[PDB]
Amino acid sequence: AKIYKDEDISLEPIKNKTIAILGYGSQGRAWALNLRDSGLNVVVGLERQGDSWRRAIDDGFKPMYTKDAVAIADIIVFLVPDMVQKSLWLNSVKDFMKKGADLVFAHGFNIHFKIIEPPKDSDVYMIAPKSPGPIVRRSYEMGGGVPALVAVYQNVSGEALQKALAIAKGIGCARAGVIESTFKEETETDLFGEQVILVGGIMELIKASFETLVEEGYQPEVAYFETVNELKLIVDLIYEKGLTGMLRAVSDTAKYGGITVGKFIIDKSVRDKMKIVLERIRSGEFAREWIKEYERGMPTVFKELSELEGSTIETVGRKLREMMFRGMLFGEQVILVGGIMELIKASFETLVEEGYQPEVAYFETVNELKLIVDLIYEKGLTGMLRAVSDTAKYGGITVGKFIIDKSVRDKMKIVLERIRSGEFAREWIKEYERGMPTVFKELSELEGSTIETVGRKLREMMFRGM
Ligand SMILES: NC(=O)c1ccc[n+]([C@@H]2O[C@H](COP(=O)([O-])OP(=O)(O)OC[C@H]3O[C@@H](n4cnc5c(N)ncnc54)[C@H](OP(=O)(O)O)[C@@H]3O)[C@@H](O)[C@H]2O)c1
Ligand SMILES: CC(C)NC(=O)C(=O)O
Ligand SMILES: [Mg+2]
Ligand SMILES: [Mg+2]
């Protein structure tokens, strides 16, 4: 697929249009700031003078009320929570917008699941950054960007795609790479990625590793540090150089440990569970369940957030990060190398087997994980969870423990015990006397694999001039 960069895209299609950004949260603030820095005409539209109104004023915007912003808009962007969009649309947009104004989304959920039926005489299109909102901004302001999908649901001008690409450039995404997709593909892959790996999976893997180290007798501060530091090292290596590059950066013993432990901790049953998660998404069952939860007041989301914020793991992480700010395990290596490699691989391959563009699968299940893990490293799980959408919070909370279930810390424990006893060392010394056939066989299968051949091509194009 074509991966569009800055030199491929003109801003001219949006140059003199008034762009109304509805909402000023995680994506909304990022888009508004980025678009304004890129020279475009932005107004911020809000329902209320609340927290995000105050934030927008502090950033030099003068927000308008939603109905007033949409009256003067050529392009209307829905950057409020997915569950809120129908109500905003019905009450503040539909009867107030210019006739023919563009309707623009950052996630396909409402259009794809037919929650909002747009008018027939508007362009309807999407730019979906494959990044948490704050990193859309942070990348842009460092002179870089994050990847994005664009899609067109309804073309009435005949230039909807060019306008989507222009907006993607305007928010910095063409510095990294933009791929054309569909509302269906974006929605399905996006919900899948956040549920199984980007929010749900990684969060539960981190908790499992932390708990397991603590049960084995490590002090909490050491269990936290070992977990998150090794996670960052491993995910950074993959982000830069793929699975093969990561494996070549660690010892042969760690290669063998990673490879074997990974398939133990993350086994076929997990691949089956990922397909279940995908079908629940495809069939509309997730959407119906999320709508029902939302209409109850999102009690599951509020509960989880408040338990997480108060938890031992988050208290310990906050204390650790603060002590590091102010200046003040080889089992864990292989458990994480294995667990993260096989979770990535299973997530990516599920999407590719199901027919989605492999490039989209790579942005969603590989590239974006580095951005997530950077947020976790900097701000803890609670900071990460605050940055992601409510849809992703709910998906992660419900699916994460399905993918990484209780048994995974049980398997971790077993592996950790074999390491501590010197049993893992005997086992490495042996496979080694067979000429490391398990290691060479895996390197050989990785070399030819879709994830590595696509990743290498994309990483070359992405890090071109970034
Ligand atoms: N978060 C991510 O990184 C991410 C990644 C890619 C795409 N997406 C997509 O981007 C879109 C926006 O998601 P987001 O997470 O950026 O949104 P968000 O941060 O949750 O949105 C908060 C904004 O929406 C307003 N809002 C909250 N409840 C509202 C209500 N009942 N009525 C009207 N306005 C309300 C808030 O105003 P107050 O301050 O007054 O409450 C605030 O301006 C979604 O389609 C999402 O799927 C998000
Ligand atoms: C992981 C997260 C940033 N991605 C999303 O698509 C979202 O927040 O909904
Ligand atoms: Mg996403
Ligand atoms: Mg999402």
Q: Give the DSSP H or E segment for 78.
A: strand 75-78
- DSSP class of residue 195 equals I
CA distance 325 to 277: 39
Q: Are 45 and 177 in contact (CB under 8 A)?
A: no
The SS3 of residue 347 is helix
Tokens 């933009």, residue located: 178
For 285-318, letters b (16+ CB in 10 Å) and e give ebbeebbebbeeebebbeebbeebeeeebbebbb
Residue 129 pairs in a beta bridge with 148
Binding annotation? 24-27, 48, 52, 82-85, 133, 190, 194, 226, 230, 251, 332, 364, 368, 389
- DSSP class of residue 434 equals T
Tokens 């678009």, residue located: 35
Q: Are 203 and 396 in contact (CB under 8 A)?
A: yes
Measure 18 CA to ligand 4 centroid, in angstroms.
26
Ion ligand 4 neighbours (CB, 5 A) are: 190, 194, 392
Q: Are 46 and 24 in contact (CB under 8 A)?
A: yes
Q: Are 242 and 448 in contact (CB under 8 A)?
A: no
Give the number of C-alpha atoms closer than 13 A to the C-alpha of residue 404, restricted to the C-beta side: 26
Beta-carbon neighbour count of residue 215 at 10 Å? 13
Phi and psi of 205, rounded to 5°? -60, -45
- DSSP class of residue 329 equals -
Q: Give the DSSP H or E segment for 148.
A: strand 148-154
Phi and psi of 219, rounded to 5°? -65, 145
Beta-carbon neighbour count of residue 241 at 10 Å? 17
Strands 124-129 and 102-105: parallel
CA distance 459 to 449: 15
The SS3 of residue 62 is coil
The SS3 of residue 235 is helix
Measure 166 CA to ligand 1 centroid, in angstroms.
22
One-letter amino acid at 96 equals: F
- Which residues neighbour 47 within 8 Å (Cβ) at sequence distance 6 or greater? 65, 66, 88, 92
Phi and psi of 106, rounded to 5°? -110, -5
- Write the DSSP assignment of 89-124 as a string of letters: IIIIITTTSPTT-EEEESSSHHHHTTSS---TTS-E
**Cβ of 26 less than 6 Å from ligand 2:** no
Q: What is the resolution of this structure in A?
A: 1.9
CA distance 387 to 84: 17
Name the token pair of 65.
């009320």
**Cβ of 392 less than 6 Å from ligand 2:** yes
Q: Are 205 and 376 in contact (CB under 8 A)?
A: no
CA distance 48 to 51: 9
**Cβ of 194 less than 6 Å from ligand 2:** yes
CA distance 221 to 210: 10
- CA of residue 349 relative to chain centroid, distance: 17
Alpha-carbon distances of 1 from 172, 312, 358, 359, 378, rounded to whole Å: 20, 45, 9, 8, 34
For 70-94, letters b (16+ CB in 10 Å) and e give beebbbbbbbbbbbbbeebbeebbe
CA distance 349 to 231: 21
CA distance 213 to 207: 10
Tokens 């310990």, residue located: 316
- What technique determined this structure? X-ray
- Ligand index nearest the alpha carbon of residue 21: 1
Q: Are 170 and 340 in contact (CB under 8 A)?
A: no
Q: Give the DSSP H or E segment for 231.
A: helix 220-249
Mutation probe of ligand 2 site: the residue of 374, 388, 397 with most atoms within 8 A of C-beta: 388
CA distance 228 to 208: 12
CA distance 211 to 202: 14
Name the token pair of 460.
């070359």
Name the token pair of 243.
């699975």
Radius of gyration (Cα) for the chain, nearest Å?
A: 23
Our CA angle for 101, 3, 148, nearest 5°, is: 50
- Strand order of the sheet with strand 102-105? 3-4, 178-180, 148-154, 124-129, 102-105, 75-78, 18-22, 41-46, 64-65
Q: Are 431 and 437 in contact (CB under 8 A)?
A: yes
The SS3 of residue 178 is strand
- Catalytic residue annotation: 107
Residue among 166, 190, 167, 177 at smallest CA distance from 144: 177
Strands 148-154 and 124-129: antiparallel
Q: Are 321 and 385 in contact (CB under 8 A)?
A: no
CA distance 348 to 266: 14
Beta-carbon neighbour count of residue 379 at 10 Å? 17
**Cβ of 46 less than 6 Å from ligand 1:** yes
Q: Are 84 and 115 in contact (CB under 8 A)?
A: no
Our CA angle for 266, 268, 272, nearest 5°, is: 110
- DSSP class of residue 17 equals -
Tokens 């991966």, residue located: 3
Name the token pair of 15.
């140059």
Name the token pair of 321.
């990060």
- CA of residue 3 relative to chain centroid, distance: 19
Length of the chain: 466
- Which residues neighbour 91 within 8 Å (Cβ) at sequence distance 6 or greater? none
**Cβ of 54 less than 6 Å from ligand 1:** no
